[PDB]
Short mmCIF file of C-alpha atoms (C1' of nucleotides) in Angstrom, two decimals:
data_model
loop_
_atom_site.label_atom_id
_atom_site.label_comp_id
_atom_site.label_asym_id
_atom_site.label_seq_id
_atom_site.Cartn_x
_atom_site.Cartn_y
_atom_site.Cartn_z
CA UNK A 1 115.47 71.88 104.18
CA UNK A 2 115.05 71.63 107.95
CA UNK A 3 116.99 74.23 109.90
CA UNK A 4 116.99 75.58 113.41
CA UNK A 5 119.27 78.22 114.86
CA UNK A 6 120.10 78.64 118.53
CA UNK A 7 120.94 82.25 117.81
CA UNK A 8 117.64 83.12 116.12
CA UNK A 9 115.03 80.44 116.91
CA UNK A 10 113.07 80.74 120.16
CA UNK A 11 113.76 78.18 122.87
CA UNK A 12 115.22 80.03 125.84
CA UNK A 13 112.48 81.10 128.22
CA UNK A 14 113.28 84.64 129.33
CA UNK A 15 112.03 86.67 132.29
CA UNK A 16 112.18 90.47 132.20
CA UNK A 17 113.30 92.93 134.86
CA UNK A 18 109.78 94.39 135.05
CA UNK A 19 106.23 93.15 135.52
CA UNK A 20 107.32 89.53 136.03
CA UNK A 21 104.44 88.41 133.80
CA UNK A 22 104.50 86.41 130.54
CA UNK A 23 108.07 85.20 129.97
CA UNK A 24 108.81 85.01 126.29
CA UNK A 25 110.95 82.42 124.54
CA UNK A 26 113.86 83.92 122.60
CA UNK A 27 116.97 82.73 120.80
CA UNK A 28 120.52 82.63 122.18
CA UNK A 29 121.59 85.72 120.23
CA UNK A 30 118.64 87.78 121.50
CA UNK A 31 119.24 86.80 125.12
CA UNK A 32 122.88 87.69 124.66
CA UNK A 33 122.03 91.16 123.30
CA UNK A 34 119.22 92.02 125.74
CA UNK A 35 120.92 90.69 128.84
CA UNK A 36 120.66 93.67 131.20
CA UNK A 37 116.96 93.81 130.31
CA UNK A 38 116.12 90.30 131.54
CA UNK A 39 116.58 89.04 135.04
CA UNK A 40 117.27 85.49 133.95
CA UNK A 41 116.78 82.78 131.32
CA UNK A 42 115.37 79.48 132.49
CA UNK A 43 115.39 75.89 131.29
CA UNK A 44 112.95 73.35 132.79
CA UNK A 45 115.61 70.60 132.98
CA UNK A 46 118.28 71.25 135.61
CA UNK A 47 120.71 69.10 133.60
CA UNK A 48 119.89 71.18 130.54
CA UNK A 49 120.52 74.32 132.51
CA UNK A 50 123.68 72.88 134.09
CA UNK A 51 125.32 72.48 130.71
CA UNK A 52 123.58 75.62 129.44
CA UNK A 53 125.19 77.93 131.94
CA UNK A 54 128.47 76.25 131.04
CA UNK A 55 128.08 77.06 127.32
CA UNK A 56 126.68 80.57 127.91
CA UNK A 57 129.69 81.12 130.13
CA UNK A 58 131.85 80.28 127.12
CA UNK A 59 130.18 82.74 124.74
CA UNK A 60 129.33 86.09 126.33
CA UNK A 61 131.90 85.24 128.95
CA UNK A 62 134.63 84.24 126.55
CA UNK A 63 134.37 87.60 124.76
CA UNK A 64 134.42 89.33 128.16
CA UNK A 65 136.89 86.89 129.71
CA UNK A 66 139.35 87.44 126.82
CA UNK A 67 141.12 84.06 126.96
CA UNK A 68 144.40 85.77 127.83
CA UNK A 69 145.87 86.84 131.17
CA UNK A 70 149.58 87.02 130.26
CA UNK A 71 152.05 88.86 132.57
CA UNK A 72 150.66 91.84 134.56
CA UNK A 73 149.58 89.78 137.54
CA UNK A 74 147.22 87.71 135.41
CA UNK A 75 144.55 87.27 138.09
CA UNK A 76 144.75 90.96 138.93
CA UNK A 77 144.37 92.20 135.38
CA UNK A 78 141.53 89.84 134.48
CA UNK A 79 139.79 91.09 137.59
CA UNK A 80 140.57 94.61 136.29
CA UNK A 81 138.94 94.05 132.88
CA UNK A 82 136.25 92.25 134.83
CA UNK A 83 135.62 95.34 136.91
CA UNK A 84 135.67 97.42 133.70
CA UNK A 85 132.92 95.44 131.92
CA UNK A 86 131.02 94.86 135.16
CA UNK A 87 131.06 98.63 135.51
CA UNK A 88 129.70 99.16 131.98
CA UNK A 89 126.76 96.99 132.93
CA UNK A 90 126.26 95.70 129.42
CA UNK A 91 127.79 94.01 126.36
CA UNK A 92 128.01 95.89 123.03
CA UNK A 93 125.93 93.89 120.46
CA UNK A 94 128.53 94.40 117.75
CA UNK A 95 131.05 92.22 119.59
CA UNK A 96 128.38 89.51 119.84
CA UNK A 97 127.54 89.53 116.15
CA UNK A 98 131.24 89.40 115.45
CA UNK A 99 131.55 86.21 117.52
CA UNK A 100 128.38 84.84 115.93
CA UNK A 101 129.76 86.14 112.66
CA UNK A 102 132.80 83.89 112.84
CA UNK A 103 130.66 80.74 113.04
CA UNK A 104 127.24 82.11 112.10
CA UNK A 105 126.58 79.44 109.49
CA UNK A 106 127.78 76.67 111.83
CA UNK A 107 125.09 76.79 114.59
CA UNK A 108 121.82 75.45 113.08
CA UNK A 109 121.88 72.04 114.73
CA UNK A 110 120.26 70.32 111.76
CA UNK A 111 123.36 71.00 109.65
CA UNK A 112 124.15 68.40 106.97
CA UNK A 113 127.71 68.73 108.16
CA UNK A 114 128.80 70.34 111.42
CA UNK A 115 125.54 70.00 113.38
CA UNK A 116 125.45 71.68 116.81
CA UNK A 117 127.25 69.57 119.39
CA UNK A 118 126.78 66.57 117.13
CA UNK A 119 128.54 64.22 114.76
CA UNK A 120 126.95 64.23 111.28
CA UNK A 121 128.76 61.15 109.99
CA UNK A 122 127.21 59.10 112.75
CA UNK A 123 124.00 58.54 110.78
CA UNK A 124 125.64 56.41 108.09
CA UNK A 125 127.41 53.83 110.27
CA UNK A 126 124.86 53.04 113.01
CA UNK A 127 122.18 50.55 111.97
CA UNK A 128 119.66 51.05 114.80
CA UNK A 129 118.55 54.53 115.76
CA UNK A 130 118.49 54.97 119.51
CA UNK A 131 115.23 56.84 119.11
CA UNK A 132 113.97 59.99 120.76
CA UNK A 133 112.82 57.97 123.75
CA UNK A 134 116.37 56.82 124.43
CA UNK A 135 117.64 60.38 124.17
CA UNK A 136 115.03 62.37 126.09
CA UNK A 137 114.91 62.34 129.88
CA UNK A 138 111.76 61.37 131.70
CA UNK A 139 111.16 59.26 128.62
CA UNK A 140 111.13 55.46 128.68
CA UNK A 141 113.88 53.56 126.85
CA UNK A 142 113.78 50.18 125.18
CA UNK A 143 114.14 48.13 128.37
CA UNK A 144 112.46 50.66 130.64
CA UNK A 145 108.95 49.86 131.85
CA UNK A 146 105.89 51.89 130.79
CA UNK A 147 104.81 53.19 134.19
CA UNK A 148 105.75 56.90 134.28
CA UNK A 149 105.67 60.26 132.51
CA UNK A 150 103.01 59.28 130.04
CA UNK A 151 103.42 55.84 128.58
CA UNK A 152 105.68 55.52 125.57
CA UNK A 153 105.58 52.04 124.09
CA UNK A 154 108.33 52.84 121.64
CA UNK A 155 105.80 52.43 118.81
CA UNK A 156 104.89 55.68 117.05
CA UNK A 157 106.73 57.89 119.57
CA UNK A 158 105.55 61.49 119.69
CA UNK A 159 108.38 63.75 118.45
CA UNK A 160 110.09 66.27 120.66
CA UNK A 161 109.63 69.91 119.77
CA UNK A 162 112.83 71.17 118.21
CA UNK A 163 113.28 73.57 121.10
CA UNK A 164 112.58 70.65 123.40
CA UNK A 165 115.02 68.52 121.46
CA UNK A 166 117.72 71.06 122.10
CA UNK A 167 117.28 70.84 125.87
CA UNK A 168 117.58 67.07 125.87
CA UNK A 169 120.58 66.95 123.58
CA UNK A 170 122.40 69.28 125.90
CA UNK A 171 121.49 67.25 128.99
CA UNK A 172 122.62 63.96 127.49
CA UNK A 173 125.85 65.66 126.53
CA UNK A 174 126.23 66.54 130.18
CA UNK A 175 124.66 63.69 132.11
CA UNK A 176 124.46 60.49 130.08
CA UNK A 177 124.05 56.80 130.84
CA UNK A 178 127.05 54.49 130.76
CA UNK A 179 127.35 51.06 129.18
CA UNK A 180 125.60 49.43 126.23
CA UNK A 181 124.40 52.20 124.03
CA UNK A 182 123.81 51.35 120.35
CA UNK A 183 127.13 50.45 118.67
CA UNK A 184 128.33 52.23 115.54
CA UNK A 185 131.21 50.75 113.53
CA UNK A 186 134.19 52.93 112.63
CA UNK A 187 136.43 51.05 110.19
CA UNK A 188 135.72 47.71 111.84
CA UNK A 189 135.29 48.84 115.46
CA UNK A 190 131.98 48.04 117.22
CA UNK A 191 131.57 48.48 121.02
CA UNK A 192 128.08 49.19 122.36
CA UNK A 193 129.77 50.15 125.64
CA UNK A 194 129.78 53.83 126.60
CA UNK A 195 131.28 55.74 129.50
CA UNK A 196 129.30 58.15 131.69
CA UNK A 197 128.97 61.92 131.38
CA UNK A 198 131.53 64.23 132.94
CA UNK A 199 129.33 65.80 135.62
CA UNK A 200 127.08 62.79 136.13
CA UNK A 201 125.41 62.70 139.54
CA UNK A 202 126.67 66.11 140.69
CA UNK A 203 125.33 69.51 141.74
CA UNK A 204 126.56 72.47 139.67
CA UNK A 205 126.71 75.82 141.50
CA UNK A 206 126.05 78.93 139.39
CA UNK A 207 125.99 82.34 141.09
CA UNK A 208 123.14 84.65 140.12
CA UNK A 209 122.48 88.35 140.32
CA UNK A 210 119.83 90.97 139.68
CA UNK A 211 120.20 90.88 135.92
CA UNK A 212 121.40 88.40 133.30
CA UNK A 213 124.55 90.22 132.31
CA UNK A 214 125.81 90.15 135.89
CA UNK A 215 125.49 86.41 136.18
CA UNK A 216 127.11 85.73 132.84
CA UNK A 217 130.08 87.90 133.83
CA UNK A 218 130.35 86.36 137.29
CA UNK A 219 129.91 82.85 135.86
CA UNK A 220 133.32 82.34 134.20
CA UNK A 221 135.99 80.41 136.09
CA UNK A 222 139.12 82.40 135.93
CA UNK A 223 141.15 80.75 133.17
CA UNK A 224 144.69 80.21 134.28
CA UNK A 225 147.37 81.06 131.79
CA UNK A 226 147.81 78.15 129.41
CA UNK A 227 147.16 76.87 125.93
CA UNK A 228 144.53 78.65 123.88
CA UNK A 229 141.38 76.57 123.84
CA UNK A 230 138.18 76.28 121.91
CA UNK A 231 134.87 74.51 122.28
CA UNK A 232 133.42 71.44 120.58
CA UNK A 233 131.65 73.77 118.18
CA UNK A 234 134.80 75.89 117.86
CA UNK A 235 136.77 72.85 116.71
CA UNK A 236 138.04 73.34 113.17
CA UNK A 237 137.48 69.70 112.20
CA UNK A 238 135.98 66.50 113.67
CA UNK A 239 137.96 64.57 116.31
CA UNK A 240 137.54 60.96 115.13
CA UNK A 241 136.63 58.26 117.67
CA UNK A 242 140.08 56.75 118.02
CA UNK A 243 143.01 58.46 119.70
CA UNK A 244 143.49 60.58 122.76
CA UNK A 245 141.01 63.21 123.97
CA UNK A 246 143.59 66.01 123.94
CA UNK A 247 144.05 68.11 127.05
CA UNK A 248 143.08 71.79 127.09
CA UNK A 249 144.45 74.29 129.58
CA UNK A 250 141.96 76.86 128.33
CA UNK A 251 138.64 77.39 130.03
CA UNK A 252 136.85 75.34 127.38
CA UNK A 253 138.82 72.49 128.85
CA UNK A 254 137.76 73.77 132.26
CA UNK A 255 134.13 74.09 131.23
CA UNK A 256 134.24 70.43 130.29
CA UNK A 257 133.34 71.47 126.77
CA UNK A 258 136.38 70.35 124.79
CA UNK A 259 134.84 67.01 123.97
"C1'" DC B 1 117.27 23.15 111.64
"C1'" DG B 2 115.08 26.95 113.35
"C1'" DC B 3 113.42 29.77 116.99
"C1'" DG B 4 113.22 31.28 121.53
"C1'" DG B 5 115.07 32.03 125.92
"C1'" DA B 6 118.70 33.06 129.02
"C1'" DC B 7 123.04 34.77 130.03
"C1'" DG B 8 126.87 37.83 129.37
"C1'" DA B 9 129.63 42.16 128.13
"C1'" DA B 10 130.77 46.70 130.87
"C1'" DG B 11 130.93 51.27 133.51
"C1'" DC B 12 131.71 50.95 137.72
"C1'" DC B 13 133.58 55.08 143.48
"C1'" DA B 14 134.50 56.33 151.04
"C1'" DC B 15 130.64 66.83 179.36
"C1'" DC B 16 124.37 68.40 180.61
"C1'" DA B 17 117.96 69.10 178.48
"C1'" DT B 18 112.15 68.51 180.09
"C1'" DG B 19 105.40 69.66 182.33
"C1'" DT B 20 99.45 67.39 181.87
"C1'" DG B 21 94.39 66.07 182.56
"C1'" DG B 22 87.36 66.97 183.24
"C1'" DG B 23 80.42 65.21 180.61
"C1'" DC B 24 76.33 62.16 182.38
"C1'" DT B 25 71.53 61.26 185.05
"C1'" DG B 26 66.22 60.32 187.46
"C1'" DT B 27 61.24 59.85 191.88
"C1'" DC B 28 57.12 59.42 195.17
"C1'" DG B 29 53.48 57.63 200.62
"C1'" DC B 30 48.64 57.23 200.37
"C1'" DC B 31 44.25 58.70 201.13
"C1'" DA B 32 40.88 61.92 202.15
"C1'" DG B 33 39.07 66.37 202.20
"C1'" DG B 34 38.38 70.92 200.53
"C1'" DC B 35 38.58 74.45 197.14
#
DNA sequence: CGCGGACGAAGCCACCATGTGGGCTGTCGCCAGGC
């Protein structure tokens, strides 16, 4: 069976502190563990990186951010723990595996159920596949002309590398076109219309440092005190199309990652 | 009656400042004598 894991499979290009020659691609778990070692991890698509730094800020960061500044001058104490871990200069791998451990079997995007940032049921109710060309950026869609980025005629399209596929999926989850995508029925409801992505047409500002760990630490908005939150992949069960997108005072609702 | 073409359905977000230049041409006086 096909399987890919963000934690173990290599997709994230990584640059080391030394030499600055031959960046190697690594998984998400490895980057997390070897963070002080690497200066940065890079994605060729700025949309892909714009959502990427958002999700990476919810993993390493969440564990370090703690999701809980109650009493004690909240802002002051989070900045105190912040100074404490910033002083350590690194994250203990055992707390990473523990986080990964909670949902270790839930990451491999190609999951039959619970695929990464995806809806698995979707396959059954949509008659026409959008196609890779409609998903991937710089790639021509059905109505798009054949002039740029290699010519894709939408007949025998060359498949995206799985690592490549991951970058695109993440971008479309951030930036995404609005109106007239392919309709899927849900108990009688068919509406090809689609609204735009949450950050669409914007510049995301991520502070950097000398090493990875620094940036990841300095990348988390301070979560105000509020309801405990979780991510789309931290959701216990699927949302369903109908109904209200519930609010989320937690930072996962402030990383625009609740839904 | 069937096929092809055209149109429609959204999601849509705003008291006061200016300076540079240089590259192309031709002429007699004629004859005779001496070296």
